[PDB]
Design an enzyme around this catalytic site. Sequence first.
Site, PDB file in Angstrom:
ATOM      1  N   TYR A 124      -3.079  -1.867   7.112  1.00 39.16           N
ATOM      2  CA  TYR A 124      -4.040  -1.295   6.163  1.00 39.16           C
ATOM      3  C   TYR A 124      -5.373  -0.923   6.849  1.00 39.16           C
ATOM      4  CZ  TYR A 124      -8.356  -2.458   3.595  1.00 39.16           C
ATOM      5  OH  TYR A 124      -9.645  -2.491   3.143  1.00 39.16           O
ATOM      6  N   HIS A 149      -4.985   2.420   8.599  1.00 38.49           N
ATOM      7  CA  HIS A 149      -4.468   3.556   7.835  1.00 38.49           C
ATOM      8  C   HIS A 149      -5.552   4.635   7.689  1.00 38.49           C
ATOM      9  CE1 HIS A 149      -2.806   6.011   4.604  1.00 38.49           C
ATOM     10  NE2 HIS A 149      -1.632   5.480   4.902  1.00 38.49           N
ATOM     11  N   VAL A 157      -4.689   1.480  -3.122  1.00 35.64           N
ATOM     12  CA  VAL A 157      -3.342   0.895  -3.260  1.00 35.64           C
ATOM     13  C   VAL A 157      -2.286   1.958  -3.625  1.00 35.64           C
ATOM     14  CG1 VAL A 157      -2.008  -0.981  -4.320  1.00 35.64           C
ATOM     15  CG2 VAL A 157      -4.468  -1.204  -4.018  1.00 35.64           C
ATOM     16  N   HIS A 202      -6.650 -10.773   2.147  1.00 35.09           N
ATOM     17  CA  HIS A 202      -7.772 -10.118   2.801  1.00 35.09           C
ATOM     18  C   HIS A 202      -8.915 -10.188   1.800  1.00 35.09           C
ATOM     19  CE1 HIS A 202      -9.940  -7.186   5.287  1.00 35.09           C
ATOM     20  NE2 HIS A 202     -10.096  -6.424   4.224  1.00 35.09           N
TER      21      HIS A 202
END
EC number: 4.4.1.26
Lengths: 104, 100
Positions: free
Chosen positions: B71, B74, B30, B4
């Site tokens: 992701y 999220h 992360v 990404h």
Amino acid sequence: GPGMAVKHLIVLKFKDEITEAQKEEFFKTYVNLVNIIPAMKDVYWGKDVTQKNKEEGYTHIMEVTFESVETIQDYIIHPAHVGFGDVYRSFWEKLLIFDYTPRK
Amino acid sequence: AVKHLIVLKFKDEITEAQKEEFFKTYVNLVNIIPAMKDVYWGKDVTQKNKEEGYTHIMEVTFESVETIQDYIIHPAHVGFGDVYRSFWEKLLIFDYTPRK
């Protein structure tokens, strides 16, 4: 720090006239520059699958990894250089090149 | 593995400290979002790009295109975008599988 990578990010949209064979040969030749340019250590490329910016039209991404604190001028004057060289600088409709050291 | 990739230009008003705040906050994602693998960023040193072009690169590694989307949605990433989207003038996103 010593051994830090210097990376070039090549962001491309090819001209409509460029064939699939031509694009394949272009990336093949670029990856092979690792064996020709001493400071060049890796080349990885790919095709965007999302198309989140279709108005900007960029389709391909190429990552070139160089050793730091080493001259890369032989790459700059190489005929295959995407921006400067006679061989491929006509292939792209749009082109961006960035130069950065990755960190976290 | 897939990538990404974010290409970014900050708003003119954004300071150096704010750019550092931005990257620190993003890299910390992360530690929060399970789907993410490693994150790196860098600043473009090309003089030609600096005046009106993009200036920063962020690379985020993921297992698959599916976990990229994990992701994206999220709550932590939604929250990040909600309060830091103001920082950038424009950006480009690419999702791709590196090959040689």
